[PDB]
Design a protein around this ligand. Structure first.
Ligand SMILES: [Cl-]
Ligand SMILES: [Mg+2]
Length: 682
């Protein structure tokens, strides 16, 4: 993780102050509004200063503030510049110098509800914004909560990439990449969530766009980031490699590849036949974007024992590509078996390798890394399999086996876990099925379900969340700390016991606009079944303090003893202490919701809810209700209507803990829209 401050530039939206605050909350940085910094230093508002002292004077003082901030606050700050800072060449050179010295100058582009004066300040400034920044991100306009979640998650991965905090992790298991081949993604915009079912990345074929200008390419990536937080593989396939981009337009190719890096794509594709100066420049400027070095035998006459494949693979190793990709053509089914022997002999780098053609299907089914898949709504001239066909054939050759998964507990009749997981299996065409099993003894569960040849995994609910832990040979850290297991899967030598209850809580917050890491504090109300997972989740999110409110203190005093001291659990003993609880922006209610709030508990809650409105952390104060019924609980009604908190019903926690459970059971990312709908449907 980089400690260097981030400078944000770009046109002023009425909420780009919020975005810089949000980013600061995520990074643990301080937010510095450079406009207010100038206004407080000079003792006057910016508007009054301009009309009284002139534009030239204002830009001089703006440049002076920039010079101080860029060196005095060069560590641990989000420096939010005034929108017009790029109007002065003094400030422009300071921005360029900051990026030249290894800093991030981030151009946050906004739609501004896409008074013609705005479009036209934009026309005058747009080139300046580009030249003064080394990174660009579209803060697009979203119309649904799911679009907002995709954009923010895309933003998080982007920030983690460009700051060097965390590179995209190359998949170790089987993985797939849906190949986006549309000339304009706006034609399938409402289908993108379904198109990406089963994919671990999206491969963007830039050369297939109807327009390859930088503006069109950037808008296409914006469309994706509103509908998928999957990592992007950015590909400009040339004509000599089966694509549409002319091989002779080398400067234009380099510019597009550099544009991908500036947009923080997870992977950029490089053709091994490209001029080596182009390859070396991109690789030396890739930063933390990963490189896939690709060669394709277009005429398809090479055999997999040909020396050309060895030379190409070794070129990929010698250029330190993160992934090598070699694509042949199958003129017989033996071409796929020859390729398997090649895969066995070249393991220094991760390798994407398969044969094209109807006779090459076997190689695409057996491929391990980022297997290209398509979708009925996309052009598919290369003839890739859909996720369902890929999973169908893999089962039919023995790659999958008919596994059985179960939810266990008592009572179990009204569990919605089977509906969630079976809908996920259906959409992925997995040969799995999910059932329920009423039980009070974990030993009858082991004899009937676990110790069976087709045992896939367990979902565990009351009253067996501790009794099941005796069968786990490997325990998750969260399972140990919370002291309960709700997911059991077979592994080598035994079984893995995990707890996804806390994952359901934090992802509920994240999906509601909360950054996945923050600096503010949290509150847990009550001692319900998910109160332990709530504490663990709040600590995972980075809450410096976790306050506790309850009717009885003895339950809370034992709660503090049962967690590590560095969790900073603090009991709210009085109403006065509730009024002075600092920076409480997250609340998990774990109290019974069948009765109304009353007593000292209500008075403590009201004071904390009242203090949530003015903290400027970049997101609304957010309350998560743990109770599944009723949908709107008294604490929810109070926080939302009286104090204007953001409010999350308990059903969201259920979907999100099942979402994580689905990944642990199957290894696949669950299709979120489908499993969310399946748990809600009555
Ligand atoms: Cl339990
Ligand atoms: Mg061949």
């Amino acid at each position: 993780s980089s400690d260097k401050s981030i400078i944000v530039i770009g046109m002023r939206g009425t909420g780009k102050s919020t975005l810089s605050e949000w980013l600061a909350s995520f990074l643990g940085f301080k937010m510095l509004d450079m406009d207010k910094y100038l206004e407080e230093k000079l003792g006057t508002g910016i508007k009054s200063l301009i009309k009284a002292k002139g534009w030239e004077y204002f830009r001089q003082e703006e440049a002076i503030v920039a010079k101080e901030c860029f060196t005095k606050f060069s560590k641990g700050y989000v420096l939010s510049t005034g929108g017009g800072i790029v109007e002065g060449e003094d400030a422009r050179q300071q921005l360029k110098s900051y990026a030249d010295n290894g800093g991030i100058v981030l151009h946050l582009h906004r739609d501004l509800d896409e008074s013609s004066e705005v479009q036209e300040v934009w026309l005058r400034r747009e080139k300046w914004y580009h030249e003064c920044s080394n990174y660009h991100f579209y803060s697009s306009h979203c119309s649904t909560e799911d679009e907002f979640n995709h954009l923010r998650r895309s933003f998080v991965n982007y920030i983690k990439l460009i700051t060097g905090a965390e590179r995209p992790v190359v998949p170790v298991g089987r993985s797939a990449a849906v190949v986006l081949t549309s000339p304009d993604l706006n034609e399938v915009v409402r289908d993108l969530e379904s198109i990406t079912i089963g994919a671990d990345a999206v491969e963007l074929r830039v050369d297939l766009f109807k327009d390859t200008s930088a503006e069109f390419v950037a808008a296409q990536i914006a469309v994706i980031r509103k509908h998928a937080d999957l990592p992007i593989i950015y590909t400009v396939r040339t004509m000599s490699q089966g694509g549409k981009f002319p091989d002779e337009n080398v400067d234009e190719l380099k510019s597009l590849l550099l544009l991908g890096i500036r947009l923080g794509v997870a992977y950029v594709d490089l053709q091994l036949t490209a001029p080596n100066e182009l390859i070396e420049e991109i690789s030396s400027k890739k930063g933390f974007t990963r490189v896939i070095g690709t060669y394709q035998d277009i005429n398809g006459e090479l055999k997999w024992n040909n020396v050309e494949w060895k030379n190409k693979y070794n070129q990929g190793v010698s250029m330190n590509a993160d992934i090598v990709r070699l694509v042949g053509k199958a003129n017989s089914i033996q071409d796929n078996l020859d390729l398997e022997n090649f895969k066995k002999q070249n393991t220094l780098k991760p390798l994407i390798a398969f044969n094209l053609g109807s006779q090459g299907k076997l190689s695409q089914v057996l491929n391990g890394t980022f297997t290209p898949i398509s979708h009925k709504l996309l052009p598919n001239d290369e003839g890739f399999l859909t996720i369902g066909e890929l999973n169908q054939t893999y089962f039919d050759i023995g790659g999958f086996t008919a596994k059985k998964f179960w939810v266990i507990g008592s009572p179990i009749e009204h569990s919605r876990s089977p509906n969630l997981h079976n809908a996920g299996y259906k959409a992925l065409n997995l040969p799995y099925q999910f059932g329920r099993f009423e039980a009070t003894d974990v030993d009858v569960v082991y004899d009937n379900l676990i110790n069976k040849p087709d045992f896939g995994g367990l979902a565990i609910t009351m009253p067996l969340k501790l009794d099941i832990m005796k069968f786990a040979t490997k325990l998750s850290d969260a399972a140990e700390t919370i002291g309960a297991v709700n997911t059991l899967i077979p592994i080598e030598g035994g079984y893995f016991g995990d707890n996804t209850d806390w994952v359901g809580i934090s992802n509920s917050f994240i999906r509601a606009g909360v950054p996945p890491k923050l600096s503010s504090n949290g509150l847990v109300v009550g001692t319900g079944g998910t109160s332990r997972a709530a504490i663990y989740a709040l600590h995972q999110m980075g809450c410096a303090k976790i306050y506790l409110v309850n009717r009885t203190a003895a339950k809370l005093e034992e709660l503090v003893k049962s967690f590590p001291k560095d969790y900073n659990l603090e009991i709210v003993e009085t109403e006065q202490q509730a009024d002075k609880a600092s920076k409480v922006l997250l609340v998990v209610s774990c109290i019974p919701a069948d009765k109304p709030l009353d007593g000292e508990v209500l008075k403590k809650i009201e004071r904390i809810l009242s203090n949530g409105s003015e903290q400027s952390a970049g997101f609304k104060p957010t309350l998560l209700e743990a109770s599944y019924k009723p949908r709107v609980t008294p604490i929810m009604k109070l926080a939302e209507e009286q104090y204007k908190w953001k409010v999350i019903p308990g059903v969201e926690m259920l979907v999100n803990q099942g979402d994580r459970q689905f990944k642990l059971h199957t290894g696949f990312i669950a299709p979120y829209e489908i499993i969310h709908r399946a748990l809600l449907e009555e």
